[PDB]
Design a protein around this ligand. Structure first.
Ligand code: 7II
Ligand code: 7II
Ligand code: 7II
Ligand code: 7II
Ligand code: 7II
Lengths: 197, 203, 201, 200, 199
């Protein structure tokens, strides 16, 4: 089996519109901040660029790689992808990078889109020594905690040295929203502690 | 399993056909949850808002026996009929910020809650006073009259503190959602709408 | 026949890319702009940004069905229909369609399409801040069908439709037919000239 | 009838294949009619213009016997091969303002006239003087060299409401070898001589 | 065989979503930027808007055809071909492709793709109004193919607009190979250093 056969077999068994679950699909999400482009302390809005490292398992994709490549890049339109959204986004995610994921032969998927997006978050203290804490909430838009679970995994490693801002700290913790409109939806709450240089 | 449910939904779903049951109007429920007010122009009477547009209706063609299978799935809206709702006083296209998936329940109930950013022409006078501005947003079927689609509010009366970001430079005083009817001189029939009154002011 | 059968039959006989001429008469298209809002006016650059309902009607007899025991009207996505290739000659932006792209088809073949459009125009903005106002002329016609294939006809002060929250008020809208020969082509192209007389409140 | 002509065009039309006949280049004619000059920045040397790009070529794969049938139809350009023309000094994507339909004549001649709004990098110096600015716009095939596509050139529709007036438009042909490739690429250079109507 | 037959056969054998590696060798992708314009420079935000032709070449032997009796090159829409998933790591906008998305395929399988791209970057704009100028570094490589699947290898002002407010002093292109914390394998990039200043 070569890469074409692996992609062909992924298309036979992949159901892009069907969650590949008695138990939730465990989605891992971790943000690497690349840039903070604009901050508005009057409107409490920030424009950021981040790599959204997203992993999950889909065992329907698995193949025997004893005599064949054990990983391929696949367009995400061929795969089920978690319907993750930033709950406090005030613009559409601008995906800056090719929309390809890596599929490993055991069914593990890795997707790392570079996203530019505007958020509503607390920008107070951005001009002080201890900085602002901007919380970004990412979770399934339409799958509750029994269908999708979300778990978090240096902070400045890929952060642009040319930003007007610097990162003091990033903490990623698991949370839960119930709204009366819609059971409980799990999210990762990413606390970006940043200040002006 | 979920694949069978999605497959069967695609066999019977007709995305371009209103799913009327015995020639009754399709009863669409619409309720806006304001999340943010981004820009307000008192000179041009224009507001830019983000809201969750909670939308429900029934399509019994979708129904399935869930006695031994999941009773709900997430389905891309391109696989479903969706009501052709428009904001009659919008001055921009609805920007949908979220994945375009609806929940289908096994009895045929559909729930769709897109997060939308949209600009409106509405009354911004009083925004910098204690009693605030009242911006009315009119949402209804663009092309289905009252005998094909009926539109009802969920919650009539609310202050939306459940949903509205306290990081906005605006605060919400009151949201009232009431049913209305427009007849235009284009057409003899009436189009039903929900009129959402957003009472808000600058902090 | 139910609504699904009507849509199915419309897709069998509808030819979206073929002008539905009957016995090589032109397709009679009716066009009427109902101004909803005037959003930006620049007296220096002579540019206006407006929102209008472009009320468009025509007949396509290929669509007709027997409605004696069935609904006599349906909403159809415009991608399933032939639609006239109308363009605003003096537009300086693409038409931004704000509304769902569905038309109503009546069982005799009459089609009604009313998109809400936001669009920028190059037109005469002089006098906008005076009592008699500006007169901004918008020219709409078929882009590629001459007068033997498409005829365009108008169907007012527009107080029914125009937002009282605009900074502008409408004094008058007049819609008049024209027929122009262009240097590319020997045939005449029909247009409606819409004269929007408006001023600052 | 028109439906049969469109049906036959869809049988033989290859939108992704240049319709060269034997070894011969497809002869593309391009001529710009300027409609508006909207924004001019003399500091950045950038202009925003609206023009009707009159484009003609032959595709004999489309040709049909019109002795008993209409000799012309409007066809969506997605059903046709269209030359891959690009403005080399454009700094924005062409905004096509008009329905994307071409006229096909029964002998295979195609006429396509999109109304385009586009921003260019060009010489705006002199715009506020009597002699005006000369903005050169360079258009040619992006991926077909001179043996596959040849390009030849050929105020009437200019808006009276522009802040600018047109003094002169000249179109000349050029043929350039670029360091990517051993073959020559043809372009038309359109020289728009224009000036501000006001004082400064 | 005519051009229609060549396109038809390319569609039979082309797998647009499958990297055309031969026997576990990386696909050798060649990338070289020709700068056309520097449009907007913000010295406060360290952001620049540039236009460049991204000259991109690789081999895909699945596309090869016998050209003894037929043209040996055609223009093909890139949606019919595998194209390397190149990304500019320090871009802060999507690439705006200004040109028709057609590549040239030679009968031996060589592909040439030269999109004209307008894109905004986060890079060092300090010194732009001085004699030695700013150095804006643009980092391009495969987003999802590591060094064993894709390798990337590299006259500056030749196509640069004389009407820009900026002039180019120097362009250097160097190869790099980076391991990122997601993944055990190395990703290749070209780092393009654009040294420019205000006229
Ligand atoms: C090199 C980048 C990357 C690697 C792998 C993938 C994939 F597996 F998801 F396809 N996407 C992007 S990077 C720099 O964004 N890795 C990190 N962190
Ligand atoms: C009337 C316009 C027109 C005519 C013909 C065509 C076509 F043949 F390309 F379809 N398009 C536009 S106009 C005025 O733009 N033609 C000229 N000049
Ligand atoms: C002439 C241009 C060109 C040539 C060839 C190709 C192709 F083969 F990739 F399709 N694209 C564009 S140019 C001027 O942009 N090449 C260079 N430099
Ligand atoms: C409000 C959001 C949501 C939940 C459920 C649905 C459903 F209709 F698809 F079921 N759509 C949207 S959510 C996940 O609670 N967001 C937040 N914050
Ligand atoms: C004008 C609006 C409407 C009515 C009918 C049609 C159709 F026939 F083309 F389908 N489209 C739009 S409406 C609903 O009256 N506007 C509001 N306000």
């Amino acid at each position: 089996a070569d890469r074409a056969d692996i992609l062909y077999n992924i298309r036979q068994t992949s159901r892009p519109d069907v969650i590949p679950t008695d138990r939730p699909v465990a989605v891992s999400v971790s943000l690497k901040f690349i840039n903070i482009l604009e901050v508005n302390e009057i409107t409490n809005e920030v424009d950021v660029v981040f790599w959204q490292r997203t992993t999950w398992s889909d065992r329907t994709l698995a193949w025997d790689s004893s005599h064949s490549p054990d990983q391929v890049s696949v367009p995400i339109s061929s795969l089920w992808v978690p319907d993750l959204a930033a709950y406090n986004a005030i613009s559409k995610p601008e995906v800056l990078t090719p929309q390809l994921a890596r599929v490993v032969s055991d069914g593990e998927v890795l997707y790392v889109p570079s996203i530019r997006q505007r958020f509503s978050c607390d920008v107070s203290g951005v001009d002080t020594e201890s900085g602002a804490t901007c919380r970004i909430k990412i979770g399934s838009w339409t799958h509750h905690s029994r269908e999708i679970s979300v778990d978090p995994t240096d902070d400045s490693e890929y952060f642009s040295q040319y930003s007007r801002f610097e990162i003091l700290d990033v903490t990623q913790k698991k949370n839960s929203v119930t709204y009366s409109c819609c059971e409980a939806y799990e999210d990762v709450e990413v606390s970006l502690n940043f200040r002006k240089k």
